[PDB]
Amino acid sequence: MTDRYSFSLTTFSPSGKLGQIDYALTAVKQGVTSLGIKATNGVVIATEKKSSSPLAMSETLSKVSLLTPDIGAVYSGMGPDYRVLVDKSRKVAHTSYKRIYGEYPPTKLLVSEVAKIMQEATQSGGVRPFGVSLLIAGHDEFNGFSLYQVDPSGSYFPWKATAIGKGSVAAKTFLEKRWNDELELEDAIHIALLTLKESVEGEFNGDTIELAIIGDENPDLLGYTGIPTDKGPRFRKLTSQEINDRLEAL
Template identity: 65%
Template structure:
């Protein structure tokens, strides 16, 4: 059971030239689960999408905080935030929780398209983040990254 999703501002093709593509594999823990209720890719705002690997409940908390940060930025500047600004905000929340409560059990890929062009960031549970041209995370990460490096 493999479903592929993509997020792109300009196209839903995996070969976007001026957009961003996020693809994920949905796996239900049990064949009894309705897989249409599982969601791995989410929009934060019209120009930014996010996907996770790890604990779903932790992702929902971070997604809510990211959406609130995007709306706050929109209220102040009358435009949605650049991807880098939103990534810093989410990474700051994750780092703060690591220091005071517990680390979030989730890694994130945050992709967006703004005036600087397409961008992709990975945020780990400690709150560290890196920009990538292409990346993969999760159980089959090594094979997926090898695939991306070859292409």
């Protein structure tokens, strides 16, 4: 034993391509469509819960994940790679920030740390790149609301609205038509649902769609009362019922 793969498995080809990164992006292309939309008073992220078999309890598989009380993430590509990145992202939010500054990191900096992890898998010895693209939405005091995309290379970009995976090219076009700088969060949710319907084949309801928001502080989700300044998480996952409520006025 000992890991004796101490050399890069991703290397430049004669044309300057990094093969493994391109191939990782190809895996993301096959992935189920996910998207994010930024409003003036919130952000929405959504995706399809494509269940593998009807005997599977699809609520036990979380595609949208809380990273911090004010930051959430969704993905397209390889689910298992996503799951371990979420574990690492949650941990790095603590080890390299909260244990130092006594507060959760701002969105861009957590995105920066996730991106670094994904970059290292593209250069370190004996590993392949992560086969996922992430959309990370969040809020912080000095930057307000934001939405970021992170790719297999470790590159990240800020968006007003975007989509990744399967039907992203069509979905991005749909989003360019409808997005403006005066959207309220309910308008953005409504657009997210409309956009998502196009890439979804069969059943389209609260049990097949996973959708979360970064919005107002929820003191009812804090778990304790009596510290005025602690006002609760801005990340909230919409219930099956809440999604279906909005699918009628659709």
